[PDB]
mmCIF file of C-alpha atoms in Angstrom:
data_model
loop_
_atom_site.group_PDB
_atom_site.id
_atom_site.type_symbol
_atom_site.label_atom_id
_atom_site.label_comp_id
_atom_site.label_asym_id
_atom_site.label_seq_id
_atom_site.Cartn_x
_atom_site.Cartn_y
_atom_site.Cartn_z
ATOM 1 C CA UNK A 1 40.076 -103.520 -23.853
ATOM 2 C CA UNK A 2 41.506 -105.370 -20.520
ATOM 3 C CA UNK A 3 40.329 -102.870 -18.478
ATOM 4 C CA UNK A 4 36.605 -103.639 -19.346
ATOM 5 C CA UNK A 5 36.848 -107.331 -18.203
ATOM 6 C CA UNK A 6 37.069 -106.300 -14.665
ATOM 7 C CA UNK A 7 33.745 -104.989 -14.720
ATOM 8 C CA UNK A 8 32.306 -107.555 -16.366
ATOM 9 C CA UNK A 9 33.449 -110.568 -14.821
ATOM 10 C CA UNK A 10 33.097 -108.824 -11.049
ATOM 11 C CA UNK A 11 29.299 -108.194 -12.936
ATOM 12 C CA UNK A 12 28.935 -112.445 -13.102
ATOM 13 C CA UNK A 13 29.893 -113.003 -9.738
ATOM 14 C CA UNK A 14 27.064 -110.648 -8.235
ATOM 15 C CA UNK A 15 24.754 -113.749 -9.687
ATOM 16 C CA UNK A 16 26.069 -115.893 -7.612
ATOM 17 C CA UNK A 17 26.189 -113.927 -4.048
ATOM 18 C CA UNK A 18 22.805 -114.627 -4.958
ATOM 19 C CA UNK A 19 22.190 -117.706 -6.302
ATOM 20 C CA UNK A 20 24.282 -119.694 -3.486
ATOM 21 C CA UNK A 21 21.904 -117.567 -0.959
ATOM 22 C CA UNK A 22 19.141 -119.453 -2.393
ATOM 23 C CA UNK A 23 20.881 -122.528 -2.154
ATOM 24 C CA UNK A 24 21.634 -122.069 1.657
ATOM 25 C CA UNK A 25 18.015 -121.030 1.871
ATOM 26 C CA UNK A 26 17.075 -124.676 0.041
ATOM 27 C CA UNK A 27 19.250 -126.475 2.752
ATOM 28 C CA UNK A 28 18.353 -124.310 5.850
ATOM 29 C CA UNK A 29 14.690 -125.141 4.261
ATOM 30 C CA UNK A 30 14.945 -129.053 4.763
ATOM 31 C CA UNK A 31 16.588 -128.833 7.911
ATOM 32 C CA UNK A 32 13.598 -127.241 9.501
ATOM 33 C CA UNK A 33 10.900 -129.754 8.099
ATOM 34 C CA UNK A 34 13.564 -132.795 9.147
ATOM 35 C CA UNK A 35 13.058 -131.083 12.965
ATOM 36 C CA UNK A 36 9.369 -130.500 12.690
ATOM 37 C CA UNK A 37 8.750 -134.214 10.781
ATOM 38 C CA UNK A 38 10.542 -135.282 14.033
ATOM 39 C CA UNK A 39 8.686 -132.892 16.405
ATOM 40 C CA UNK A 40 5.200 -134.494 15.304
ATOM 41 C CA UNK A 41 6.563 -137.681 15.657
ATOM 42 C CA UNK A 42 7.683 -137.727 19.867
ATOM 43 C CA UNK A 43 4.204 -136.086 19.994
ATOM 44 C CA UNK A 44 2.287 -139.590 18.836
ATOM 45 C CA UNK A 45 4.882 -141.385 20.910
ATOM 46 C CA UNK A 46 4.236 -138.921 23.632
ATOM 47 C CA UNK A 47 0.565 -139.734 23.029
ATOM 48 C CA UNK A 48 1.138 -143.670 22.910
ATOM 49 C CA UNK A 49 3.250 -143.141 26.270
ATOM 50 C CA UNK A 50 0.610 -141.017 27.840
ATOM 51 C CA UNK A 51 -1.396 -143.989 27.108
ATOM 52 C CA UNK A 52 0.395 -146.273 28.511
ATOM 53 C CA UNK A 53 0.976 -143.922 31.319
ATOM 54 C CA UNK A 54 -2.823 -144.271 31.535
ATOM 55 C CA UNK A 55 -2.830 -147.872 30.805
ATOM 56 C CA UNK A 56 -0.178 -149.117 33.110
ATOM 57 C CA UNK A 57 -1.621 -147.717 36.142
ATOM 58 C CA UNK A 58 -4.154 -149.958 38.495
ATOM 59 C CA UNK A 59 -2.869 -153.214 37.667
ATOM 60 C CA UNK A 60 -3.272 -153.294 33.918
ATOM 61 C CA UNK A 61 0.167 -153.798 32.478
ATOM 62 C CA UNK A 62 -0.901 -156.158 29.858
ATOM 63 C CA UNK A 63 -2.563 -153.394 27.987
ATOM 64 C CA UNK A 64 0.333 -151.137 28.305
ATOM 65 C CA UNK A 65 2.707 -154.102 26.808
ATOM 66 C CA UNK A 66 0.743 -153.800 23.780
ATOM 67 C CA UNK A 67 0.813 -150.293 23.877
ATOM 68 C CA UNK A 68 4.403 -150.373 24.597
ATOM 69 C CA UNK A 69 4.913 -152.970 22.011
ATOM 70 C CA UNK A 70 2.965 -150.327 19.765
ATOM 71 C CA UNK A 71 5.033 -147.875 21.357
ATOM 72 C CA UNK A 72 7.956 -149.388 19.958
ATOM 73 C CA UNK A 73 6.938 -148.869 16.145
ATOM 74 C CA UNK A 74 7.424 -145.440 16.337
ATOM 75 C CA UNK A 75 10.039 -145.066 18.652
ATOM 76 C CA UNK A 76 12.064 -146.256 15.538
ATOM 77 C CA UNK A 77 11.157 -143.948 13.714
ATOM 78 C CA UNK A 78 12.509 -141.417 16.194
ATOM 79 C CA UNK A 79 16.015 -142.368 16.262
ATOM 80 C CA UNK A 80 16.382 -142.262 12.857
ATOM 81 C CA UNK A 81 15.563 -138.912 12.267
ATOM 82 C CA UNK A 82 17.489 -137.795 14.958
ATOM 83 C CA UNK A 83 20.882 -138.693 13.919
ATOM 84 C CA UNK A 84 19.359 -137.243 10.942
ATOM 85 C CA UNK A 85 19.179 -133.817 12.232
ATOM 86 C CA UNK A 86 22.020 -134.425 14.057
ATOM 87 C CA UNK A 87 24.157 -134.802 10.815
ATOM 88 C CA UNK A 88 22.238 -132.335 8.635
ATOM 89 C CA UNK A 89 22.971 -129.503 11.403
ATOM 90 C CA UNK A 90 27.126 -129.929 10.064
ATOM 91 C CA UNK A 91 25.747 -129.290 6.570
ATOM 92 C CA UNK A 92 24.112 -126.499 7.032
ATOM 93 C CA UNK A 93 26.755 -124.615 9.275
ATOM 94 C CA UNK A 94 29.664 -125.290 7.002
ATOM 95 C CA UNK A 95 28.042 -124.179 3.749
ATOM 96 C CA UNK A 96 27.282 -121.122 5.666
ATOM 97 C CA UNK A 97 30.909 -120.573 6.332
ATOM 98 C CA UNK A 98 31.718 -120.970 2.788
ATOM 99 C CA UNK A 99 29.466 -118.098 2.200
ATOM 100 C CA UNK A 100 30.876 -115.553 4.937
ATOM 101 C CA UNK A 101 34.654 -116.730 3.663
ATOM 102 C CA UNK A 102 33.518 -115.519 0.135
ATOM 103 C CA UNK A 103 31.416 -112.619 0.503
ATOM 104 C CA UNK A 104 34.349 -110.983 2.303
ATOM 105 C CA UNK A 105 36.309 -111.715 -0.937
ATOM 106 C CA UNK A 106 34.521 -110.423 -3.186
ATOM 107 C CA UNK A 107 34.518 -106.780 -1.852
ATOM 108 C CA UNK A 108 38.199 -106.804 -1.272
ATOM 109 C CA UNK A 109 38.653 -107.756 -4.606
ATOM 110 C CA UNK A 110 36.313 -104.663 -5.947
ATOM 111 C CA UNK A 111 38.504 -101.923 -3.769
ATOM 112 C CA UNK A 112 41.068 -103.361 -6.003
ATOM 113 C CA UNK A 113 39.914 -102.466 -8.929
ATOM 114 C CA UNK A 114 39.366 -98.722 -8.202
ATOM 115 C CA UNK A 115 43.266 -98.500 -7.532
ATOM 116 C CA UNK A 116 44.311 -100.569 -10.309
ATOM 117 C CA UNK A 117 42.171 -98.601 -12.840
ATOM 118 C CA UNK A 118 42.744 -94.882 -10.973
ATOM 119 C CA UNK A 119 47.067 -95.684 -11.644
ATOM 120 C CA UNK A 120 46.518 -96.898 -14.852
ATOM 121 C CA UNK A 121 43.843 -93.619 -16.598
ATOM 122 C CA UNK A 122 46.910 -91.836 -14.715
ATOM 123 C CA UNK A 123 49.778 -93.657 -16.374
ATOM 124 C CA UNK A 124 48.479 -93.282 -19.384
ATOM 125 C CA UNK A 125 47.893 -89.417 -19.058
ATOM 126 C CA UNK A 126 50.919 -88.835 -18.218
ATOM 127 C CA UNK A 127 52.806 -90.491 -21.035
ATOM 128 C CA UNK A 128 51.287 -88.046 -23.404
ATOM 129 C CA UNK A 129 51.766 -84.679 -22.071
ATOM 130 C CA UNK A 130 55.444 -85.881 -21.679
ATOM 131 C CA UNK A 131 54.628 -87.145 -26.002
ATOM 132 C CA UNK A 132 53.290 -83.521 -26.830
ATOM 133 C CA UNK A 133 56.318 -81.680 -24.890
ATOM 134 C CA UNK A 134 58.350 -84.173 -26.321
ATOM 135 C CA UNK A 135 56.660 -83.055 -30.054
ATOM 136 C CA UNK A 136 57.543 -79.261 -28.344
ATOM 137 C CA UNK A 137 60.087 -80.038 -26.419
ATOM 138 C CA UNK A 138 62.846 -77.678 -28.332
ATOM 139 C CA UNK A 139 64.945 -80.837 -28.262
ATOM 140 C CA UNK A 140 66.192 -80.074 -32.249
ATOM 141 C CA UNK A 141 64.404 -83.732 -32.930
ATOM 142 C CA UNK A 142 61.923 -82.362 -35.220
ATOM 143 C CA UNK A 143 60.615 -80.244 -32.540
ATOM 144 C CA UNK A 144 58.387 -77.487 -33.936
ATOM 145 C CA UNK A 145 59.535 -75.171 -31.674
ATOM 146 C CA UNK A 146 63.320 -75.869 -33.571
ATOM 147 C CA UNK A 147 62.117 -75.537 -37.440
ATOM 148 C CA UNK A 148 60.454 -72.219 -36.204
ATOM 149 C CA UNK A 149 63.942 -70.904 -35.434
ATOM 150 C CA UNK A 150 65.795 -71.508 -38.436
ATOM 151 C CA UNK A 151 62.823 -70.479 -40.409
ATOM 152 C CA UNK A 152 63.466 -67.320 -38.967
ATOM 153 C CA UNK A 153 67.025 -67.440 -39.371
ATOM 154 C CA UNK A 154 66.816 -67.792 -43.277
ATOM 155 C CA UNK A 155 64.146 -64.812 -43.243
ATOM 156 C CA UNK A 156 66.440 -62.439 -41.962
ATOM 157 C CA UNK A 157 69.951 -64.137 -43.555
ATOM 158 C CA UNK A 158 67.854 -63.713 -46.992
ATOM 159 C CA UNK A 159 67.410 -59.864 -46.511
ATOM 160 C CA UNK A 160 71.233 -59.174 -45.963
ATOM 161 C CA UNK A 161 71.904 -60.261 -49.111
ATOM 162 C CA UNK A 162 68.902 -58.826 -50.651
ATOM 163 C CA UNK A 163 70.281 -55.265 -48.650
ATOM 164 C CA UNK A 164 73.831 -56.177 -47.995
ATOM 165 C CA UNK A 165 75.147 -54.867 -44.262
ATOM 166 C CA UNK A 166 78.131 -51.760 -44.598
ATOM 167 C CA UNK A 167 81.388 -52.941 -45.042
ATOM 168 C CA UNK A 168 84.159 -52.498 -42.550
ATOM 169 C CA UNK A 169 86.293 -50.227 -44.607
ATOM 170 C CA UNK A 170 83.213 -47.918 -44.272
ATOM 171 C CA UNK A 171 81.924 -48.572 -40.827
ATOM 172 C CA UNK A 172 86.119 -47.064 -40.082
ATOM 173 C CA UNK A 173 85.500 -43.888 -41.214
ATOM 174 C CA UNK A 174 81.849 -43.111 -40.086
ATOM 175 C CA UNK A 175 83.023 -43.301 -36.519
ATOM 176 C CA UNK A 176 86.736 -41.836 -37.125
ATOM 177 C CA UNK A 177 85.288 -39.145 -39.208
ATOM 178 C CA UNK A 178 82.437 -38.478 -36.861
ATOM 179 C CA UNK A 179 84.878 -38.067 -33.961
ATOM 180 C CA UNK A 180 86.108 -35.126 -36.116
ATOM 181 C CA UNK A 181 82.587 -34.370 -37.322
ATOM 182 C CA UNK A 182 81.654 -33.860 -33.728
ATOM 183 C CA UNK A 183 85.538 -32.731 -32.657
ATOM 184 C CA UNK A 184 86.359 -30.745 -35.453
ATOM 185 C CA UNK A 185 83.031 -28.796 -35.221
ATOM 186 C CA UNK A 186 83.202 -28.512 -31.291
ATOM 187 C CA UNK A 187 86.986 -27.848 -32.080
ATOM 188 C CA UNK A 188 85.652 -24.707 -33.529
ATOM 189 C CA UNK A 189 83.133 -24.815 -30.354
ATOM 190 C CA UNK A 190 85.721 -25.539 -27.862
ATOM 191 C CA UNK A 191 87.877 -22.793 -29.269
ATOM 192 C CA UNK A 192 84.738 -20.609 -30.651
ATOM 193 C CA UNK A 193 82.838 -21.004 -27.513
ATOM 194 C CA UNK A 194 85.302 -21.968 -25.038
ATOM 195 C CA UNK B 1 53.128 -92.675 -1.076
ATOM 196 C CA UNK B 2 51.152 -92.973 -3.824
ATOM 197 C CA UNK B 3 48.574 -89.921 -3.592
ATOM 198 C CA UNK B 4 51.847 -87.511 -2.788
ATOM 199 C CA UNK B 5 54.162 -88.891 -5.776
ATOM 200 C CA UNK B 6 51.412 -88.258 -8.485
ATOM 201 C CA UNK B 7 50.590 -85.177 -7.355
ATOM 202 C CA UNK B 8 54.676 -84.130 -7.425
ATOM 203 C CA UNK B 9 53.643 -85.500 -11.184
ATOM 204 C CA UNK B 10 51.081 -83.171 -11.711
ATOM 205 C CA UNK B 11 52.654 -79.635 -9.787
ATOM 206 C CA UNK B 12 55.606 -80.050 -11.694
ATOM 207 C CA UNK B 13 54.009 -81.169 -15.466
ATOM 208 C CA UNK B 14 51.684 -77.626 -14.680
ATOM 209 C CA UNK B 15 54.382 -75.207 -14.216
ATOM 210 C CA UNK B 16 55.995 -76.575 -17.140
ATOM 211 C CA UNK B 17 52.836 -75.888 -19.810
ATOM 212 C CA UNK B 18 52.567 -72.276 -18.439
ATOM 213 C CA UNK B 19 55.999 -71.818 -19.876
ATOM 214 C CA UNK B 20 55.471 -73.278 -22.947
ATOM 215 C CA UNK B 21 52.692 -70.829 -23.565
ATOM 216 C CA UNK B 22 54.917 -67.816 -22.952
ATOM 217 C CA UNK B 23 57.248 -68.439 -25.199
ATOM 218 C CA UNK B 24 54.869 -69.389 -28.369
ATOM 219 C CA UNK B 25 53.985 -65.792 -27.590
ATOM 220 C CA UNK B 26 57.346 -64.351 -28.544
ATOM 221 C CA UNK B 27 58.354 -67.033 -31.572
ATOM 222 C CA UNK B 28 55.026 -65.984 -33.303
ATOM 223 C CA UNK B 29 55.708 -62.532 -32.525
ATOM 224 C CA UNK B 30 59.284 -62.397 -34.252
ATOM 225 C CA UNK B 31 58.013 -64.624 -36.557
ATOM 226 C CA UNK B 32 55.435 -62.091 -37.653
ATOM 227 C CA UNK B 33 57.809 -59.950 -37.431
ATOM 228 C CA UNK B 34 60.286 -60.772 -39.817
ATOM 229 C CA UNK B 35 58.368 -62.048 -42.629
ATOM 230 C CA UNK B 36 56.746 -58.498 -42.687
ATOM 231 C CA UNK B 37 60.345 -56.261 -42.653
ATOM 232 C CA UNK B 38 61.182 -58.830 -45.630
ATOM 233 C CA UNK B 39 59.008 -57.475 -47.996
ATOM 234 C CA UNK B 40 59.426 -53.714 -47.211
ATOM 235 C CA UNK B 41 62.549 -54.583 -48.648
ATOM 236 C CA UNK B 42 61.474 -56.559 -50.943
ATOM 237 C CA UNK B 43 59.096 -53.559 -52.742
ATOM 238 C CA UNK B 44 61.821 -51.194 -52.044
ATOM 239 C CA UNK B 45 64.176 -53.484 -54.053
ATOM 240 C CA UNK B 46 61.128 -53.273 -56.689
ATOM 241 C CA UNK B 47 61.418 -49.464 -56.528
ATOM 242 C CA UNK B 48 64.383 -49.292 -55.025
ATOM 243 C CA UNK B 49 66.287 -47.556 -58.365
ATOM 244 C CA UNK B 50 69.396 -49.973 -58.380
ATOM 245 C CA UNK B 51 69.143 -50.572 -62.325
ATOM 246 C CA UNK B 52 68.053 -54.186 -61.572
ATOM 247 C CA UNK B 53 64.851 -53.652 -63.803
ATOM 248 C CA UNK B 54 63.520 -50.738 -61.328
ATOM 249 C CA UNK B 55 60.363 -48.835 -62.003
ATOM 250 C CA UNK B 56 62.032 -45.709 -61.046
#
């Protein structure tokens, strides 16, 4: 039946609605250790520059060189994983989108299916009372109704013969001599009892 | 559009079936009917002394 798919396949794509949540989740996920790997990071360097912020002071700017030229070590590090964030914050927001474009299709698509399957239990109802008139339709196309009829005409059609109907020679005189019958009796009336 | 036409559908299809029903009322009836004043004169014609091998 065709009409079963629809509930079926729209019963797949509920895995999914939740499946790709967990992927955004997985993404979303990374992005946040990225920024706190990088947090900890400026923290040391924040450290090293306190240090030389400490060191540089009261004529010592030798030792801060070297802590500066330590320093330098990690502020490498820190400019790579910023771009890093940077770049992984367009990932995150587009895949997102993809998400809110599709969960609005997918319930559009299900208030579909309550129209599509409401017409067609109709249409098909329909057909068939207009079938069983059709089968009792008195349309003399094998309609029951029709054989019914005739059946009855051949009941009664069988009995005249069986008890044939008066002739018309004799249905003549039981009225003409009745008109006497009643005249010539009230023509003794009308002249008896005048 | 849709809600008022099928319901047209449905008013009109109802009034229709309550009509049927009346009239299987009266076939049946004269139905009924007939087949039962048949043989009246069909056991008359038995007895009905016409020399056709009558009891009478």
């Amino acid at each position: 039946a065709p009409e079963d798919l629809l509930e079926r396949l729209l019963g797949e794509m509920e895995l999914e609605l939740i499946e790709l949540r967990r992927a955004l989740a997985q993404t979303i996920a990374t992005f946040k250790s990225t920024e706190r790997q990088r947090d900890a990071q400026q923290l040391i360097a924040q450290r090293w520059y306190e240090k030389a912020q400490a060191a540089l002071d009261r004529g010592n700017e030798q030792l801060a060189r070297e802590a500066l030229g330590q320093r330098q070590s990690y502020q490498s590090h820190t400019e790579a994983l910023g771009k890093s964030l940077g770049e992984q914050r367009a990932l995150v927001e587009q895949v997102r989108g993809q998400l809110q474009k599709l969960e609005r299709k997918y319930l559009e698509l299900k208030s579909q299916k309550n129209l599509y399957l409401a017409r067609l239990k109709s249409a098909i109802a329909a057909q068939k009372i207009e079938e069983i008139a059709g089968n009792l339709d008195n349309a003399s196309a094998s309609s029951l109704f029709e054989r019914i009829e005739t059946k009855i005409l051949e009941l009664e059609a069988e009995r005249e013969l069986l008890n044939p109907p008066p002739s018309p020679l004799d249905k003549k005189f039981e009225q003409w001599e009745e008109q006497q019958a009643v005249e010539a009796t009230l023509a003794a009336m009308k002249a008896r009892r005048s």
